[PDB]
Amino acid sequence: TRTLQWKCVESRRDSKRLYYGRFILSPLMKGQADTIGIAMRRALLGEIEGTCITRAKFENIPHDYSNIVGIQESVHEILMNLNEIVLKSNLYGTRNALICVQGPGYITARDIILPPSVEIVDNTQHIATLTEPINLCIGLKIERNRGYSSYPIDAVFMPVQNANHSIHSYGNGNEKQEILFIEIWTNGSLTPKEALHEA
């Protein structure tokens, strides 16, 4: 129906936290594809917001470089595991979440008690290993922001891992029309199609 169309030509799920999408936009007048491509790339890599854990509070810990009896990992290793947890949310504001568990077992992302505005992306993400029936309570803070940043957690909010675009000649020089392709990689907090619309 429309003269200028766009469509997802490939959408792939590499893993729970690696989404791929390729999109086409054609036909475009000469020069328009270059304008769209660079602006879209800069918006995808620099203007899309995400949400993740910003800090964690430990109950009976002297410093973040000590060890806890009953936990295979160290306190510093816990913070790194928390930093890699992928969250999704549309709202702003500093939220708080909770980890309140009793061992032994495997602490994963699905064990986080999340406020109703926040959701987990990958359940299987590993937080800690408990080798003893101990009590572990960890407070969490969560924010939605742009770019990147109790023990603070170095949050990298950007959900778009990478982006790419290509420009191809449509054909004979009727108006020197061009074809635009856009490739988007996300971390699963939003789909590549949603990232394209948000940008």
């Binding site: 129906t1 936009l25 304008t35 602006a39 879209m40 394209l196």
Partner: peptide
């Protein structure tokens, strides 16, 4: 500004079903 906006409106287009 208007020409830039017109370039990115198409990504928000939907199709009749």
């Amino acid at each position: 500004s208007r020409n830039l906006i017109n370039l990115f409106i198409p990504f928000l287009h939907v199709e009749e079903e």
